[PDB]
Write an enzyme that holds these catalytic residues in place. Structure first.
Site, PDB file in Angstrom:
ATOM      1  N   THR A   1     -32.645 -11.303  -3.528  1.00 24.27           N
ATOM      2  CA  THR A   1     -31.247 -12.216  -4.153  1.00 24.27           C
ATOM      3  C   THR A   1     -31.469 -13.621  -3.867  1.00 24.27           C
ATOM      4  OG1 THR A   1     -29.988 -10.429  -3.529  1.00 24.27           O
ATOM      5  CG2 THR A   1     -28.932 -12.416  -4.306  1.00 24.27           C
ATOM      6  N   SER A  62     -24.262  -2.878  -6.450  1.00 29.95           N
ATOM      7  CA  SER A  62     -24.501  -4.143  -5.661  1.00 29.95           C
ATOM      8  C   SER A  62     -23.439  -4.615  -4.713  1.00 29.95           C
ATOM      9  CB  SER A  62     -24.610  -5.304  -6.807  1.00 29.95           C
ATOM     10  OG  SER A  62     -25.248  -6.427  -6.471  1.00 29.95           O
ATOM     11  N   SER A  63     -23.647  -5.313  -3.712  1.00 29.84           N
ATOM     12  CA  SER A  63     -22.977  -6.301  -3.031  1.00 29.84           C
ATOM     13  C   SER A  63     -23.151  -7.679  -3.583  1.00 29.84           C
ATOM     14  CB  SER A  63     -23.583  -6.233  -1.318  1.00 29.84           C
ATOM     15  OG  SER A  63     -23.490  -4.792  -1.177  1.00 29.84           O
ATOM     16  N   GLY A  84     -28.233  -8.756   0.797  1.00 33.81           N
ATOM     17  CA  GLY A  84     -27.796  -7.501   0.581  1.00 33.81           C
ATOM     18  C   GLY A  84     -26.406  -7.261   0.857  1.00 33.81           C
TER      19      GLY A  84
END
Ligand SMILES: N=NCC(=O)CC[C@H](N)C(=O)O
Ligand SMILES: [Ca+2]
Ligand SMILES: [Ca+2]
Lengths: 182, 360
Positions: A1, A62-63, A84
């Site tokens: 990310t 997702s987070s 994450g």
């Protein structure tokens, strides 16, 4: 990310978290095409039966937490982070630090974060004092002997009274904020 | 350049080169959506371990014209041939994370490219050609790598040695160091292909045919028809109120917005700033709160097209009250089970609660 953000003169606001999962995704480079392929599907539960089970055509949980905060229905602050499942911890702690504690945006971002998803998984950034870590551990927590950086918050403040944007990039990566005049 | 001010625009990104590209877009009269698209491309090239057109993302946009907030969701999807047990082995045991995370079964149909186009149609102002080309040059001519990318190459050298990345990132077998030029000839070609043809080349074209090919080489079941099936979605935010502010964040298929809001809701009543930021009490209370919300996350969160996420219950003020009984300075709570948010919302869950190993 990675997380980035952009404000313009027309009052549009962008807050964009985007990823290929692990660093380099799977690691699979498309032969002759130079691009990395995600391992996003391991964000699924490995053992099925639950809300986040693998299914064909399904999106793995997702987070990622791209966020815009508003005062009197006008945007005032963008927040987001990589990391994450820690992303939730990075965003809420920033928001806590800015609005509950009244820190400056940079102080809010740089303040040591903690993360704990369970009784068997704890992290903290350097700057938690030693004596307090000990006392937390004596009380039942499991903060380790080694600090780690948590997240990487990029954020823009929209200051209407001073008619200005302020951008901040977390020191956990080599990000920058760059402002634009006319 | 960690902090900056500006009268007519602002950009903040994880890479100095993507920040400047982004700034320049706004400086030449581009809007924030123009700048964002160019930034994603620049980051694909300069921070290629972290995102790009081989992945997916959530792009939140407040529209300055309509005063509406929306999210372009380019999250990846499982191929038609993914199976519920595809990360279990012969014996039914979880495949270790470092194996399954390198396998072809791990690759979702990427969405990023279709996200940038959807966003461009709706708000775009400069031609995509102008937005893509600075990244074409970074790819083609190369740039000196920052420390984070260097450390990333070194830490993942084993994963990278077993793939076609070996040559670009591990040249003559060693990891590129900080300051060394990274050149990405093949990446540049793909961006030119997209610059001339658009996303047809990706989702109904040669780039995609190549993606499906490499995914089967590594063991997964993604076909070209997975690629032509894919379209992004558009979501309304999940909204919350905190400390007199309205907060828009990301709904399912993220866990992010709901649990960030839930954590805020749970801690609000503790008036945390009565304690020093580096105090025992603050760290303890946050730790106890997190345990509760992350347990809720493990039990109740998934793609809402397939499963029902009790959003209303998870943020219900009476539910918050119930869970707040487990949060106290008196002791550490050892009852860290998910709560029962379904009690405060219409319906039952359509799934079991399956414990997972912490191996990721
Ligand atoms: C890099 C990112 O931190 C990975 C994000 C993770 N795959 C998620 O979607 O929550
Ligand atoms: Ca307060
Ligand atoms: Ca930090």
């Amino acid at each position: 990310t990675t997380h980035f953000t952009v404000t313009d003169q027309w009052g549009n606001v962008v807050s964009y978290t985007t990823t290929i999962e692990q660093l380099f995704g799977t690691g699979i480079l498309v032969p002759g095409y130079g691009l990395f392929l995600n391992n996003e599907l391991t964000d699924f539960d490995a053992i099925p039966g639950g809300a986040n089970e693998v299914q064909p055509n399904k999106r793995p949980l997702s987070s990622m937490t791209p966020t815009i905060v508003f005062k009197d229905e006008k945007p005032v602050l963008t927040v987001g982070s990589p990391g994450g499942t820690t992303i939730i911890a990075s965003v809420f702690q920033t928001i806590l630090n800015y609005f509950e504690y009244g820190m400056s945006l940079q102080d809010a971002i740089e303040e040591p974060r903690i993360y704990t998803n369970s009784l068997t998984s704890y992290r903290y950034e350097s700057g938690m004092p030693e004596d307090v870590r000990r006392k937390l551990n004596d009380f039942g927590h499991k903060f380790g002997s080694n600090p780690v950086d948590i997240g990487n918050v990029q954020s823009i403040f929209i200051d209407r009274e001073n008619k200005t944007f302020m951008g901040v990039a977390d020191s956990s990566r080599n990000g920058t904020a760059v402002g634009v005049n006319n | 350049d960690k902090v900056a001010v500006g009268k007519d625009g602002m950009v903040a990104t994880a890479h100095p080169l993507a920040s400047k590209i982004g700034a320049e877009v706004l400086k030449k009269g581009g809007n924030a959506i123009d700048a964002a698209i160019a930034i994603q491309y620049a980051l694909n090239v300069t921070e290629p371990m972290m995102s790009g057109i081989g992945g997916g993302g959530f792009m939140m946009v407040y529209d300055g014209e309509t005063r509406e907030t929306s999210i372009i969701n380019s999250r990846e999807r499982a191929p038609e041939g993914a199976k519920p047990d595809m990360f279990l082995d012969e014996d039914g045991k979880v495949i270790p994370f470092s194996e399954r995370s390198r396998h072809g079964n791990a690759v979702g149909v990427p969405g990023t490219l279709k996200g940038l186009e959807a966003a461009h149609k709706k708000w775009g102002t400069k031609k995509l050609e102008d937005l893509i080309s600075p990244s074409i040059k970074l790819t083609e001519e190369g740039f000196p790598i920052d420390s984070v990318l260097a450390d990333a190459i070194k830490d993942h050298q084993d994963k990278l040695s077993k793939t076609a990345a070996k040559d670009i990132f591990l040249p003559d077998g060693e990891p590129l160091k900080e300051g060394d030029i990274l050149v990405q000839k093949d990446l540049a070609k793909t961006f030119k292909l997209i610059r001339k043809e658009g996303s047809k080349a990706f989702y109904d074209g040669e780039i995609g045919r190549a993606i499906a090919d490499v995914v089967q080489d590594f063991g997964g079941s993604m076909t070209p028809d997975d690629l032509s099936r894919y379209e992004v979605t558009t979501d309304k935010p999940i909204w919350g109120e905190y400390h007199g502010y309205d907060i828009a964040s990301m709904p399912p298929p993220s866990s992010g917005g709901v649990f960030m809001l839930q954590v805020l809701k749970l801690i609000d009543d503790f008036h945390l700033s009565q304690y020093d930021p580096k105090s025992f009490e603050k760290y303890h209370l946050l730790a106890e709160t997190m345990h509760l919300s992350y347990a809720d996350r493990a039990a109740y969160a998934g793609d809402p097209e397939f499963v029902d996420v009790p959003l209303r219950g998870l943020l219900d003020p009476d539910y918050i009250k119930e869970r707040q009984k487990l949060i106290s300075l008196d002791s550490m709570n050892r009852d860290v089970k998910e709560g029962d948010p379904w009690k405060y919302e219409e319906g039952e869950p359509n799934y079991e609660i399956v414990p997972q190993p912490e191996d990721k």
